[model samples]
Target: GHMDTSKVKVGVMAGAEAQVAEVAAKVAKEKYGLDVELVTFTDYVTPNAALDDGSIDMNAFQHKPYLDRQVEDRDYKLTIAGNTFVYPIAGYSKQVKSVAALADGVRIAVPNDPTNLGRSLLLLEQQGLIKLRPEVGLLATVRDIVENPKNITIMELDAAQLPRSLDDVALSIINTTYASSINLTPEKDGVFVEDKESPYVNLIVARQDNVQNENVQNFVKAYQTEEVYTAAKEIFK
Candidate 1:
């Protein structure tokens, strides 16, 4: 079974994530003798669709909440194989010096994807810009906003397009992968950054049927190594 499943196709986002996968693939080959093919994707939606259709063996791009939301919406039989890193999402701004300085009725951009939309709202709530409905938690949406003291206009855009929307909005919440791709580190470029202890750790996902397969296990082992961790730190830091 191990010999038969020596090779695996892993789906990941195109820029920073692909670079991390490159290291995992290298380690998978050298240490585990597993051949990993990194298939790069641009959007948030396709990796799961590709995996569900058997186009890819696994994907390494999303966190549990995001995967859970996708599964609920699309009925995809996907499950996490192992943990990856927590890419703390942050808001970047070209116009404002700090979140406190945001003017009344300023426009803000957030991801349109459900989970991340909620994440963006939570971050804004943390900044005391808006208040979400009590107990809505990770499922919060623009409709869940109970109070907006600033009356800020929220613009929802595709996650991939948020960086480009910076010129149009006062602030744009961006995932670290895309932020790093454009040389926007949280420490230097972020107006607000998510806390490191959040539950949004990224994962390696596989279809339920093949989750226990030897190659999938091997690939997970390859990805969870110290070398891969070091590589991820170097790229994502």
Candidate 2:
């Protein structure tokens, strides 16, 4: 069952790259019959910043982990209001085929952003290909690396600069937003994509104080229905 969608305005974020606002807004409007005033942003920072600043009613861009880090560091006062899709973390390369093939001194490019760099390192660690000192915490860097089964070289660069760096390095860990920006399908291009069951799922975020609002609750329920899940299957499958 859908909620009374007339009483609220929804703001959505499609990230720094490929715009999904039109499709999301259309679907939100058509499926839920909501007064959807879609707002789009270029950078990941602005979308949630807008939500915190009252520039938007709600935002669907970052996952909970990303939101948690931002809230802890920047004090955004936000919480996950709902769930969304997951674009699995993936490893891409022009030189390597499998994680096992990663030779010593092979350069692995990663996004320099705090959230993404941590996520990439975690993915590599999850694959048993690398290790990092635990003190590295959420904001890990190349220097935090502790183990080198493959003697991998992790290089951090601007997220937007990753795709361009592909040719210069042996491999790279590309974030989905940046990958989507360049229309590079991670599933197809990845030498080792994160497992589907991984918890990198995206979320809809609201101010920490918005938890008890009826609008937020309705949006959460409506957003979790079969309709949206089906949409996710189409996009992420």
**TM-score of structure candidate 1:** 0.95
Per-candidate count of clashing residue pairs (backbone under 3 Å): 0, 0
Off by over 4 Å in 1: 1-6
Q: How well does candidate 2 match the true structure in TM-score terms? A: 0.80
lDDT of 2 by residue, 83-193 (tens): 767778787887777877567778888877688888889888877878889767666767778887877778888866787788999888877776666666677788888
After aligning candidate 2 to the native by TM-score, how far in Å is the CA of 69 from where it should be? 1.5
Instruction: Give the per-residue lDDT digits (tens) of candidate 1, residues 84-158.
Output: 888788999999979886899999999998899999999999999999988898978988999999889999999
TM-score per candidate, chains pooled: 0.95, 0.80
Best by lDDT: 1
Instruction: Enumerate residue pairs that collide in model 2.
Output: none
